Specification:
This is part of a larger assembly, with 2 copies of chain A, 1 copy of chain B (295 residues), 1 copy of chain C (226 residues) and 1 copy of chain E (225 residues). Chain C has 9 helices and 4 strands; from the N terminus they run αββαααααααββα. Chain C is mainly alpha-helical and 226 residues long. Chain E has a two-stranded antiparallel sheet with strand order 1-2. The longest helix of chain E has 26 residues, at 79-104. Classes of the chains: A mainly alpha (60), B mainly alpha (295), C mainly alpha (226), E mainly alpha (225). Chains in contact: A-D, A-E, B-C, B-E, D-E. Chain D: Necessary for the recruitment of gamma-tubulin to the centrosome and for the formation of a functional centrosome. Chain D: Interacts with gamma-tubulin. Chain D: It is found in: Cytoplasm, Cytoskeleton, Microtubule organizing center, Centrosome.
C-alpha cells in the first residue's frame, strides 16, 4: 500500500502520456504540431507544462 | 426433550456474536418463512447453568432478528436495484446506513466476552433502540408520509438516545426536499423526474395572457396537506407557491420544534424578500395608476 | 448445567422448561440429573425470568393504548434491564474460567434481583389495572417513587426523570414559537388575533403547583398570537 | 508479501516476472492461481498490472 | 473455518482489481460486460451469503472497465474520450483504497464482514457509474445530446447530495472540451471541430447556417443566440 502512493504520482504522469500516444499513429510532421496545440489549449498546468515541453520540441 | 451433552461456554460467546451481525452459527438456523432466527429446542447446550441459555439466547436472537430486517430494507430501496421508490424514501435510508456502521463498529468490539450477560446488558440500551428503529417503517409510509412519520417520531422525546438519531434522520431526509425549495424560489426550475411530490405542467396558452400560466390547479389540489417540514407548511407552503409563481414571471418578461422554528422565519424572510421584488416589478412595468385613472 | 440456567433466565422456551410464549409455563420435572430440592430453586429462578418476558411484551406493544409518554416510559424501563443484562454477561465468563461451578452463586446474583424485579412488576400491574393514559402515568410513578427500597427508589426516579424530560421538551417548545406540539393533545394546555387557550387538570402533575400552570399557559398563549 | 514486491518490479521493467500473466492488451492482469489466500492481492496486482501495461506502451 | 475464511478474503482481493480469482472463475456474457461469477462449492451456507453480498461491487466495476476500455475504440475527438479517461482517474482512486486494504492484509485482522463494511461507501459510487456507462452504450449518444442524457441522469439522481456531487464532477469533465470549442465559436467566430465536436454548418444570399446537431442540454434560446 505504501508503494501504491509512490506509483500513484506516475499514474498522473504516464496516463497523460497515454493520451499523447493515442492521438498520433502516424509520424508525419505538421499534423503533429496541430496535435500538441490541442493539448495546450486545455488548462491545469500539471500536464500542460509537459505538453508545452513537446510544443517547444515538435516546433523545433 | 433431551438432545445431547453440553457444548462449551466459549462457543456460546461466539455464536451470539454471529447472530448480531446477521450470520447463522452452528446453533442458529435462520428461517425465511418467518424471517426469524431459531435456536435448537432442547438439552443441546441450553445453558451450562440448566436450561437458562435456552431462553436467554432467544432474547438476543430476537434482538438479532431485527437487525437483519434493517439491512434487508436498506438493500431493497436503493435506486441501483429499484426504480419505483422516491428520493425522500431514499434519503431516509442514507441516514439509516450511517447508523448501520455504528452497529458494525460496536459489534466488532465485544471480544473478549466474559459471559452472556456482559454483552446483552451492554446492548440493553441498544436493544430498546433497534426495536424502535425497524418497526417505525413496517402502515408502510412512503416519501412525504414517511417524512411525516419520522418527524412525529423525532417529536417523541422523553427519550434522549432515540431523539438525536431521529433528529439526524430528519436532517438527512429533508435534504432532497429542501433542495427543491431554493431552486423553486430563486429561479423556478422543477428538478425531480420521479418523486413522491406530484408534478404539474403549468402549460400556458400563447393567445391568452391570463396569469402567465393560464392553469395551474394544485398538485395537492384541494386538501393542500403540505406536511412535517419547517414552518409546518400550512401557511408558507401556500406562499412558496405564489413566490414560485412570480419568480419565473420575472423570467421571460433542545426541541424538534425550536430548530424547526429557526428555519421557519428565514423561510418567512426570503418569501417576503421575493415578494417585495414582484411588487417593484409590477411598479416598473404596469404603470397601473395611470391605467387606473384611465378606466 | 451452567448454560441451561442463564438461558432459562433470558426467557426463551425449552422442552424441560416448556414455555409457549410470554405468559404460560409447565415445569415438567421428571428429571434424573436434578434433585427435588434443585427443581424448587429452578422455579425460584424462573419467576425472575417470567417477569422479564412480561416486560418485553410491554415493549413491543409500545415500541416497533397510546400516548407520547408510554414510550417515554419505555426508555425508562430499558435502563432497569441494562445492569440486568450486564449481569448476564458477567456470568458468562464465570462459566469459562471454571466450568464446574454449581448453581448457588447464580442463585446468589438472582436474590439480588429478587427485590428489584417483583417491585417493578407490582408497579406495571397497578399501571395497567387503572387504564392510565398521558401525564397520569408520571403521577403514578411519582407516588411509586414515593416509596423506599433505596435501589428501587432510584430506579423509579430514573423512569421518572426520562418522561419528565419529555415534559421538559414540551414547555421548551411551547415558549419558543408558541407551537403546541401535540398529536393526541397530551398536554394541559389545549386550544380553547388572540386565539384563547385553556387548562386541563388531568394532564397537570399535582407535584407541580397548580398556580404555576397558567404562568406557562397564558404567556405561551400570548407568544402564540404573535 | 515480499515476493509480490519483487514481482511488480519486473513488469515495471518490461514483461512478466515470477508468474505468467498472458496479457499484453487492455491490462497485463496478474494471475497467481491461488484461492486460499485473500482477495486483497488481486486488486493490488491489478493496479500494478495497469502501470506495467502503461510502461509497455 | 477461519482458514477457509482467509481463503476467501484473498479470492475477494483478486476480483477487486478486475483479475480472475483463484476459486472464483468468471464467465463472460458477451466478453465480461456483465460478469457471471462462479464461486466454489460450499460446505457452509454461512460464508456463501457473505460472498454473495460482496460480488455486486465487482459487477458494477466490470461495467465501467468495459466502457472505459471501449473508449480506446472511441479514439476520436469527442466528449466521450475525455469523460471516460476522467472515469479512469476515479478507477485509479478506487485502486488506492484496495491497496490500503491490502496494506491492512499485512497481518490477519480481516474477515468477510470486516471488508464488507469498508466496501459500503464505494458500492453506491460504483453503481451510479454503472448506470451511466450502460446508458451511454445502448443508444450511442454523441456530443451534446450526451450532455442532455447525463443531465437527466443528474436530474434522476436528485437526492443523496454527497453523491450528486460526484456525478456533477463527471458531467463537467465531459463538458470540458465542449466548452473550449465554444469560446472559439462565440469569441473568435472560427470553429475548430475534430469530428463533429460542436454543432456547425459551413459558411450573396448564402444560407441560414442554422444548426442544432449537438443539442446543448439547456433550453432552446441559447442555441439560436
Amino acid at each position: 500500500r505504501r508503494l501504491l502512493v509512490w506509483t500513484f504520482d506516475p499514474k498522473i504522469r504516464l496516463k497523460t502520456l497515454a493520451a499523447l500516444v493515442d492521438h498520433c499513429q502516424g509520424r508525419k510532421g505538421g499534423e503533429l504540431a496541430s496535435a500538441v496545440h490541442a493539448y495546450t489549449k486545455t488548462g491545469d498546468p500539471y500536464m500542460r507544462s509537459l505538453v508545452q515541453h513537446i510544443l517547444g520540441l515538435v516546433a523545433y | 426433550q433431551p438432545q445431547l451433552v453440553l457444548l462449551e461456554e466459549t462457543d456460546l460467546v461466539k455464536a451470539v456474536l454471529n447472530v448480531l451481525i446477521g450470520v447463522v452459527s452452528s446453533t442458529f438456523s435462520y428461517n425465511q418463512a418467518l424471517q426469524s432466527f431459531a435456536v435448537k429446542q432442547g438439552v443441546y447446550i441450553s445453558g451450562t447453568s440448566p436450561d437458562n441459555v435456552s431462553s436467554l439466547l432467544t432474547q438476543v436472537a430476537e434482538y438479532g432478528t431485527y437487525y437483519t430486517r434493517l439491512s434487508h430494507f436498506s438493500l431493497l430501496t436503493v435506486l441501483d436495484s429499484s426504480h419505483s421508490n422516491g428520493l425522500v424514501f431514499q434519503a431516509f435510508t442514507s441516514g439509516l446506513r450511517k447508523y448501520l456502521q455504528y452497529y458494525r463498529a460496536c459489534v466488532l468490539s465485544t471480544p473478549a466476552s466474559l459471559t452472556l450477560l456482559t454483552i446483552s446488558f451492554l446492548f440493553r440500551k441498544l436493544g430498546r433502540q433497534l426495536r424502535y428503529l425497524a418497526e417505525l417503517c413496517c402502515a408502510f409510509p412512503t416519501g412525504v408520509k414517511l417524512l411525516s412519520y419520522l418527524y412525529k417520531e423525532a417529536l417523541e422525546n422523553s427519550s434522549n438516545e432515540n431523539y438525536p438519531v431521529l433528529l439526524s434522520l430528519l436532517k438527512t431526509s429533508c435534504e432532497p426536499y429542501t433542495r427543491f425549495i431554493y431552486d423553486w424560489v430563486y429561479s423556478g426550475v422543477f428538478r425531480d423526474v420521479c418523486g413522491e411530490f406530484m408534478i404539474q405542467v403549468n402549460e400556458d396558452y400563447l393567445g391568452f395572457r391570463d396569469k402567465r400560466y393560464w392553469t395551474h390547479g394544485y398538485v395537492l389540489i384541494s386538501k393542500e396537506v403540505e406536511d412535517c417540514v419547517p414552518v409546518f407548511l400550512k401557511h408558507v407552503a401556500n406562499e412558496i407557491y405564489i413566490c414560485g409563481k412570480t419568480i419565473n414571471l420575472l423570467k421571460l418578461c433542545s426541541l424538534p420544534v425550536l430548530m424547526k422554528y429557526s428555519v421557519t422565519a428565514p423561510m418567512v424572510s426570503h418569501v417576503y424578500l421575493v415578494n417585495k421584488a414582484i411588487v417593484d416589478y409590477y411598479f416598473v412595468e404596469l404603470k397601473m395608476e395611470r391605467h387606473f385613472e384611465a378606466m | 448445567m451452567i448454560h441451561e440456567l442463564l438461558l432459562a433466565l433470558s426467557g426463551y422456551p425449552g422442552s424441560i422448561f416448556t414455555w409457549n410464549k410470554r405468559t404460560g409455563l409447565q415445569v415438567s420435572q421428571d428429571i434424573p440429573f436434578l434433585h427435588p430440592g434443585e427443581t424448587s430453586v429452578l422455579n425460584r429462578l424462573c419467576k425472575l425470568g417470567t417477569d422479564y418476558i412480561r416486560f418485553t411484551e410491554f415493549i413491543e406493544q409500545y415500541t416497533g393504548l397510546h400516548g407520547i409518554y408510554l414510550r417515554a416510559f419505555c426508555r425508562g424501563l430499558d435502563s432497569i434491564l441494562q445492569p440486568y443484562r450486564q449481569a448476564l454477561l458477567d456470568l458468562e465468563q464465570e462459566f469459562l474460567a471454571d466450568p464446574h461451578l454449581s448453581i448457588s452463586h447464580i442463585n446468589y446474583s438472582l436474590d439480588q434481583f429478587h427485590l428489584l424485579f417483583p417491585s417493578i412488576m407490582v408497579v406495571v400491574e397497578q399501571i395497567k389495572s387503572q387504564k392510565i393514559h398521558g401525564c397520569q402515568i408520571l403521577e403514578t410513578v411519582y407516588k411509586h417513587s414515593c416509596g423506599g427500597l433505596p435501589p428501587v427508589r432510584s430506579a423509579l426516579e430514573k423512569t421518572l426523570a426520562v418522561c419528565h424530560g419529555v415534559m421538559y421538551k414540551q414547555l421548551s417548545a411551547w415558549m419558543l414559537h408558541g407551537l403546541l406540539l401535540d398529536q393526541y393533545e397530551e398536554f394541559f394546555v389545549r386550544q380553547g388575533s388572540l386565539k384563547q387557550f385553556s387548562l386541563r387538570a388531568e394532564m397537570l402533575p399535582s407535584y407541580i403547583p397548580v398556580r404555576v400552570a397558567e404562568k406557562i399557559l397564558f404567556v405561551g398563549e400570548s407568544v402564540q398570537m404573535f | 508479501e515480499t515476493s509480490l514486491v519483487r514481482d511488480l518490479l519486473y513488469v515495471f521493467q518490461g514483461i512478466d516476472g515470477k508468474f505468467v500473466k498472458m496479457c499484453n492488451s487492455e491490462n497485463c492482469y496478474k494471475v497467481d492461481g491461488k484461492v486460499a489466500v485473500s482477495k486483497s492481492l488481486k486488486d493490488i496486482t491489478s493496479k500494478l498490472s495497469e502501470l506495467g501495461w502503461l510502461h509497455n506502451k | 473455518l477461519p482458514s477457509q475464511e482467509t481463503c476467501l478474503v484473498e479470492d475477494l482481493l483478486y476480483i477487486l482489481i478486475g483479475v480472475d480469482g483463484r476459486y472464483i472463475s468468471v464467465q463472460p456474457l458477451v466478453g465480461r460486460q456483465s460478469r457471471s461469477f462462479s464461486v466454489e462449492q460450499n460446505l457452509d451456507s454461512s460464508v456463501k451469503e457473505l460472498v454473495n453480498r460482496i460480488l455486486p461491487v465487482a459487477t458494477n466495476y466490470s461495467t465501467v472497465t468495459r466502457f472505459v476500455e471501449e473508449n480506446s475504440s472511441f479514439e476520436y475527438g469527442q466528449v466521450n474520450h475525455a469523460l471516460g479517461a476522467a472515469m479512469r482517474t476515479l478507477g485509479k482512486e478506487y485502486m488506492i483504497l484496495i491497496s490500503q486494504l491490502e496494506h491492512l492484509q499485512r497481518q490477519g485482522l480481516l474477515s468477510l464482514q470486516k471488508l464488507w463494511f469498508y466496501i459500503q461507501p464505494t458500492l453506491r459510487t460504483m453503481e451510479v457509474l454503472a448506470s451511466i456507462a450502460t446508458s451511454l452504450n445502448k443508444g450511442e449518444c454523441f456530443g451534446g445530446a450526451t450532455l442532455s442524457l447525463l443531465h437527466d441522469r443528474t436530474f434522476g439522481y436528485t437526492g443523496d447530495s454527497q453523491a450528486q456531487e460526484l456525478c456533477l464532477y463527471l458531467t463537467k469533465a465531459a463538458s470540458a472540451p465542449y466548452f473550449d470549442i465554444l469560446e472559439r465559436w462565440i469569441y473568435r467566430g472560427i470553429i475548430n471541430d475534430p469530428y463533429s465536436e460542436f454543432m456547425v454548418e459551413e459558411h450573396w444570399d448564402q444560407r441560414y447556417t442554422i444548426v442544432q446537431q449537438q443539442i446543448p442540454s439547456f433550453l432552446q434560446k441559447v442555441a439560436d443566440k
